[PDB]
Amino acid sequence: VRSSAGAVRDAGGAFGKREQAEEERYFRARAKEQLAALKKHHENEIS
Amino acid sequence: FAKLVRPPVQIYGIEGRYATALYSAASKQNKLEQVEKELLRVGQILKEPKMAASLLNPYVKRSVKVKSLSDMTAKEKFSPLTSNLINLLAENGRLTNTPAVISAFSTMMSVHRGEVPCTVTTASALDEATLTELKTVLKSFLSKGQVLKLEVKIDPSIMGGMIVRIGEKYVDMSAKTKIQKLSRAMRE
Amino acid sequence: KTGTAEVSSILEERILGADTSVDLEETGRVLSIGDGIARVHGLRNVQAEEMVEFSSGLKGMSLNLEPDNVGVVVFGNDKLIKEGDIVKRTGAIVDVPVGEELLGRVVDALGNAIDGKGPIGSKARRRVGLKAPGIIPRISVREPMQTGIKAVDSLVPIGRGQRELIIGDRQTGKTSIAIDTIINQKRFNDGTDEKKKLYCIYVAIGQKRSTVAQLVKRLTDADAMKYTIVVSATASDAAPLQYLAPYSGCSMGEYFRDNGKHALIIYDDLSKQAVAYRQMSLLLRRPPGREAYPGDVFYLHSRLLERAAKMNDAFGGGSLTALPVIETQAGDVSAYIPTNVISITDGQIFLETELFYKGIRPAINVGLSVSRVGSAAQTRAMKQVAGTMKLELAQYREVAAFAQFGSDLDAATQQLLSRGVRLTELLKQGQYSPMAIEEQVAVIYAGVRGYLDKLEPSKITKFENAFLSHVISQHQALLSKIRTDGKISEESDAKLKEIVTNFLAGFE
Amino acid sequence: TTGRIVAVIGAVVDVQFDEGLPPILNALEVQGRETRLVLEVAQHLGESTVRTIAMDGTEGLVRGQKVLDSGAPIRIPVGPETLGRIMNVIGEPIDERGPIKTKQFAAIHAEAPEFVEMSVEQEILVTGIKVVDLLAPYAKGGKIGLFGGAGVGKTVLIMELINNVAKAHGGYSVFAGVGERTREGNDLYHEMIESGVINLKDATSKVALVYGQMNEPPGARARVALTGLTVAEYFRDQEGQDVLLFIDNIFRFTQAGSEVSALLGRIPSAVGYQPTLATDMGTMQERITTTKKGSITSVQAIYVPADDLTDPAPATTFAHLDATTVLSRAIAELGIYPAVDPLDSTSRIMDPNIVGSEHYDVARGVQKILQDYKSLQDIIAILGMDELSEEDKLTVSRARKIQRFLSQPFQVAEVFTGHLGKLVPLKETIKGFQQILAGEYDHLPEQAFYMVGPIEEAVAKADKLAEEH
Ligand SMILES: Nc1ncnc2c1ncn2[C@@H]1O[C@H](COP(=O)(O)OP(=O)(O)OP(=O)(O)O)[C@@H](O)[C@H]1O
Ligand SMILES: Nc1ncnc2c1ncn2[C@@H]1O[C@H](COP(=O)(O)OP(=O)(O)O)[C@@H](O)[C@H]1O
Ligand SMILES: [Mg+2]
Ligand SMILES: [Mg+2]
């Protein structure tokens, strides 16, 4: 019996949900930052 | 395969298959009555305590059993059909259920000659006149040429009345069932 | 108790003495027919596994000889067979045609052409159920069977007379390994060296007809049919044909083995022959075992695979390599048939889906792959480079976990990771693009001497290509020297050094 | 010939013939039924008895009921008159619209095409679905599979394909619903009537329907697939034209075969399956093929019991298909719809010499990045995203953008999502994924790519997200 890549999130135990959340929070933060930058660029490029 | 002629009543099991083979064989060549008589004969012939003891021992080789049965059949001057049937039952080792085969063929021949077994059950016995009218009416139930085979048991468990079986037909004019019916319907 | 021949029809026949006009020695009457199994009454002089012929033009193999009846397995649909039919002996166990008249022809499990190219020559016939050779005729495996795949020829060498095993999951590249092996033999068959020519047999058990048609087109495109036989036992074929097709192929290959030539037979797929045999056994009411497989299912594959031998010069010297293919379900090499055939064969090429999508195609997973023959089935030059390549890859596989971190680790681990990544990018290969042994050894020699420690891993697949085209065009004398000689002589080593440095000196 | 029922056990009826027996696979008609009950012969048991599977309920059968022997297998009406209708396994109509008036009846049992009839040409079939077109492109005349458990999108995806390919397809089409909910059969009937492929007034219908839904006894479910296959075969050969053939699910054929095997006297196999699973499935899947006389594009929905792709039924079905699109529940939970698994789907034409080097390289880059993402997810479960190499975060961001960009809104899933269906031409999908990999969008947020068509729509959605920020 072996182990394969992407198995922690295949089991779906506690580590799977923990990893999913650790990813989602970080990328929500980065999406917020990128959206702020996109708004700034929009405003600065109207003229 | 040879289109065997089916028997009137289908008997099932090992005895059923052997008896149906015998009935199909006899029905062609028209030897049903003689073969039935020979079957009744072998019913007693094999029943002899010496022969029965010598045929229920599975350590006498099938060869010896077949030879003894051939000698008996020759000594009894049977039809080739019955001799071959006994030989076949001996080769296949089916002697322990030979009486089952004879009983099956008896049941199968009785229906061939048009008989419908009947049963009558009453709390007490009957007077012969009443039994005569019973014969008449039950013959009324039957079809044309269908002889009747009455049996009059006496069951005191029922409280009276009468119970009649004609083949699969059944009529229950017994006190007990009507008591049960009233008690149940009234209980509801 | 009861017998199946005690039906009232047989007893009726026997009571009135009608059993003497019927010849129950060479003919029989079907008692039952269903799900491709017929139960026949008579045929008292019929041998086990003999072929009988039904009245309606069908054939069948008599497998179960019981006291009452014979259990025949029908070679086709049981639509045409009815209870009461007449079955006649053929007299001979099943055999198939053999010879060079089959090469380039697609045949079915019984040697009948199905490609519509006309009758089949068929000068000689051979029984499919023939015992394999013994201890004495064989001799150790020494010659190599050039697969044309860098991984298989470098780290999982296959000799001649060896039984490898392409075990893997679904859609990993097993048939691709087989087809590349078949196609790479054109460089030998075209040439004149008569002891390097390999004739190929492709047994296609249980594949749909479109797959086999596309495969035959692929071989024809590569001009690799003139020395290939294809034996089709596709899904629509009756279970007995799928069960026999490996044996028909093995006998068509045993012909070549017995006559001094060399053959390669690729039983693809054996896990479907096992299923067909399981069907036949369950419908013959034989006692099931693990996973419903009959008891003698190890026997079925062992007596097939033990016919892949390397006869000695006192018998001809020919050989019959076998490359059985098995499809494991999840990764389960501990299942029943995978276990049996892993314990029967001499090695295994273990393919992956993690590696297939990580970009490592062919997905040969080294470390799980093995060849108990090993270096004995390699050329001297390939030995020289592959010893170092295998050692370095083994070192790389035990520190591959750190590959993600990599940095913040000692210099030795950094070097191991770098060399391993370069080597893995080297073992990558295209599809249907086998490589001569000189090409492989040149490429691996460049790789394993550090001459790629400067190139970025993404550029190794382009280096390999450009460098290989270079050497193949400019430098043919060195490649010819390595090929014919078989080893890397010191002067040839120096020439390879200068060539690799000069090409790498400017690559950009 | 005339025979006589001698046993009835579940769906299996044993019929005794005094005259000559009927050959296996023949259809027999029970005499004394208000409706039409058809038995199909499956075995000869000797002693003139034949075992049969009933194509209808065996309630009210009496030991002794006379049976007629039709002399031929089940023969269904075939021709252009079946278009726009609905049928049983035995071909009688169930749309309450009158008899099907054809001149040709075709037996539902036939031999598969021989090896000298196989077409070896493949060209992509553009379906308009991003994931399908990119990673597991289909092919005209090839057999497609849609694996996946229950509730992952098999029916929605197949309805979407009928919406796209069938609507704008010149040739005919056939839909054989095998052992599926009758609600869905009615919904499809009405959706097709609305779209116009089924025209109840004129003779311009382009779809013929055959239904064997899951209220039928196993005998009918095991044969409705053959009925639909016969209709498709006729349209392939005689009409000499392209055909589509949708089946849903082709696992109910196997399962229905398994519900009667034990009563026919066969010992079971690996997991309560009939010993003849592979042969029974092959003798059917081998008639769904693109011969040189016609061309059937077969789309099959294949239930995978309990998401187990290693079950004998789906495992065996895998070998009969050119393209597969393994819908995955683990991806449908994330909201990515269709839930096609990009790493577990394959196609035969997915080679650089059939699609092109750009298409092939984009597909392989996407698959590699997704596999690397899977490898990284194990580490992120311990470290956390904040501790990854600044290159790894780039891989994770690209992987999430690609994961979302494969989602797409269907025109048939308007009710669920409420969005509007998009059809994405193949070049636009290739461009979108090539750009996402090349890094030309590593500033837009992930959610901009979720449930949009071409990449420009993702840019517009990101612009809207920023404006209302
Ligand atoms: N080295 C390779 N490079 C690129 N593509 C490859 C390589 N090997 C295999 N493939 C591709 O992977 C796909 C599956 O390969 P293949 O069919 O040979 O595997 P398989 O295990 O035989 O499949 P199955 O067992 O289901 O028949 C094929 O379309 C093939 O073109
Ligand atoms: N394209 C889609 N978009 C959104 N939801 C979907 C989509 N496809 C399927 N679903 C979800 O799946 C359910 C329908 O699944 P369905 O495909 O009918 O089941 P199965 O695939 O098991 O036959 C719906 O309730 C819906 O929520
Ligand atoms: Mg394959
Ligand atoms: Mg559904």
Short mmCIF file of N, CA, C and O and ligand atoms in Angstrom, two decimals, chain C residues 169-177 268 327 356 361-362 429-432, chain D residues 347-348 350-351 360 364, ligand 1:
data_model
loop_
_atom_site.label_atom_id
_atom_site.label_comp_id
_atom_site.label_asym_id
_atom_site.label_seq_id
_atom_site.Cartn_x
_atom_site.Cartn_y
_atom_site.Cartn_z
N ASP C 169 -2.09 0.99 -14.51
CA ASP C 169 -3.50 1.31 -14.37
C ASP C 169 -4.10 1.51 -15.76
O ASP C 169 -3.48 1.18 -16.77
N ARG C 170 -5.32 2.04 -15.82
CA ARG C 170 -5.96 2.31 -17.09
C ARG C 170 -5.47 3.64 -17.65
O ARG C 170 -5.30 4.61 -16.90
N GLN C 171 -5.25 3.68 -18.95
CA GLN C 171 -4.75 4.87 -19.64
C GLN C 171 -3.49 5.41 -18.96
O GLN C 171 -3.46 6.51 -18.42
N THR C 172 -2.45 4.58 -18.99
CA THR C 172 -1.12 4.98 -18.53
C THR C 172 -0.04 4.83 -19.58
O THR C 172 0.99 5.51 -19.47
N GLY C 173 -0.21 3.97 -20.58
CA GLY C 173 0.76 3.87 -21.65
C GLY C 173 1.23 2.46 -21.94
O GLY C 173 2.24 2.28 -22.62
N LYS C 174 0.51 1.46 -21.45
CA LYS C 174 0.96 0.08 -21.61
C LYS C 174 0.98 -0.32 -23.09
O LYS C 174 2.01 -0.79 -23.60
N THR C 175 -0.13 -0.13 -23.79
CA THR C 175 -0.15 -0.43 -25.21
C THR C 175 0.86 0.43 -25.96
O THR C 175 1.37 0.01 -26.99
N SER C 176 1.15 1.63 -25.46
CA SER C 176 2.16 2.45 -26.10
C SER C 176 3.55 1.85 -25.93
O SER C 176 4.35 1.86 -26.87
N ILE C 177 3.86 1.31 -24.75
CA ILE C 177 5.12 0.60 -24.58
C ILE C 177 5.20 -0.55 -25.57
O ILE C 177 6.22 -0.76 -26.24
N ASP C 268 -1.81 -8.77 -24.69
CA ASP C 268 -2.46 -7.54 -24.27
C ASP C 268 -3.95 -7.72 -24.53
O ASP C 268 -4.37 -7.61 -25.69
N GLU C 327 -3.81 -4.84 -16.24
CA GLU C 327 -4.36 -3.57 -15.79
C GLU C 327 -4.77 -3.69 -14.33
O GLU C 327 -5.78 -4.32 -14.01
N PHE C 356 2.32 10.18 -15.14
CA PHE C 356 1.84 10.50 -16.48
C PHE C 356 1.47 11.97 -16.59
O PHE C 356 1.76 12.61 -17.61
N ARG C 361 6.28 11.19 -19.29
CA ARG C 361 5.70 10.20 -20.19
C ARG C 361 6.79 9.69 -21.12
O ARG C 361 7.41 10.50 -21.82
N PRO C 362 7.06 8.38 -21.18
CA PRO C 362 6.37 7.25 -20.54
C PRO C 362 6.46 7.27 -19.03
O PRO C 362 7.46 7.69 -18.47
N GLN C 429 10.33 10.71 -23.16
CA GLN C 429 10.38 10.30 -24.55
C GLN C 429 9.07 10.68 -25.21
O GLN C 429 8.05 10.85 -24.55
N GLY C 430 9.12 10.83 -26.53
CA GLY C 430 7.92 11.16 -27.28
C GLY C 430 7.00 9.97 -27.35
O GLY C 430 6.98 9.14 -26.44
N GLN C 431 6.22 9.87 -28.42
CA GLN C 431 5.40 8.70 -28.67
C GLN C 431 5.68 8.19 -30.07
O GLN C 431 5.78 8.97 -31.02
N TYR C 432 5.81 6.87 -30.20
CA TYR C 432 6.10 6.24 -31.48
C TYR C 432 7.39 6.77 -32.07
O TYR C 432 7.55 6.83 -33.29
N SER D 347 -8.88 11.14 -23.96
CA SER D 347 -9.43 10.95 -25.29
C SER D 347 -8.39 10.29 -26.16
O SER D 347 -7.19 10.39 -25.91
N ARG D 348 -8.86 9.59 -27.20
CA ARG D 348 -7.93 8.95 -28.12
C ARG D 348 -7.29 9.98 -29.05
O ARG D 348 -6.09 9.92 -29.31
N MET D 350 -6.50 12.85 -28.47
CA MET D 350 -5.67 13.81 -27.77
C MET D 350 -4.21 13.51 -28.07
O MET D 350 -3.46 13.07 -27.19
N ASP D 351 -3.79 13.76 -29.31
CA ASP D 351 -2.41 13.62 -29.73
C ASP D 351 -2.02 14.86 -30.52
O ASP D 351 -2.88 15.50 -31.14
N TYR D 360 -2.45 20.69 -27.95
CA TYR D 360 -1.88 19.63 -27.13
C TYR D 360 -1.01 20.20 -26.02
O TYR D 360 -1.09 19.75 -24.87
N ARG D 364 -1.62 19.80 -21.99
CA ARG D 364 -0.64 19.15 -21.12
C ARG D 364 -0.12 20.12 -20.06
O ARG D 364 0.14 19.71 -18.93
N1 LIG E 1 5.32 8.68 -23.89
C1 LIG E 1 4.14 9.27 -24.21
N2 LIG E 1 4.10 10.54 -24.64
C2 LIG E 1 2.94 11.14 -24.97
N3 LIG E 1 1.75 10.53 -24.90
C3 LIG E 1 1.65 9.25 -24.49
C4 LIG E 1 2.87 8.53 -24.11
N4 LIG E 1 2.49 7.30 -23.75
C5 LIG E 1 1.15 7.23 -23.88
N5 LIG E 1 0.65 8.39 -24.32
C6 LIG E 1 -0.78 8.68 -24.58
O1 LIG E 1 -1.58 8.28 -23.47
C7 LIG E 1 -2.82 7.76 -23.94
C8 LIG E 1 -3.11 6.43 -23.28
O2 LIG E 1 -2.05 5.55 -23.64
P1 LIG E 1 -2.33 4.00 -23.93
O3 LIG E 1 -3.70 3.86 -24.53
O4 LIG E 1 -1.16 3.45 -24.69
O5 LIG E 1 -2.38 3.44 -22.44
P2 LIG E 1 -3.17 2.10 -22.07
O6 LIG E 1 -2.94 1.81 -20.62
O7 LIG E 1 -2.90 1.05 -23.11
O8 LIG E 1 -4.70 2.48 -22.24
P3 LIG E 1 -5.75 1.30 -22.02
O9 LIG E 1 -5.00 0.38 -21.11
O10 LIG E 1 -6.94 1.95 -21.38
O11 LIG E 1 -5.97 0.76 -23.41
C9 LIG E 1 -2.72 7.58 -25.44
O12 LIG E 1 -3.63 8.45 -26.12
C10 LIG E 1 -1.29 7.90 -25.78
O13 LIG E 1 -1.20 8.65 -26.99
#
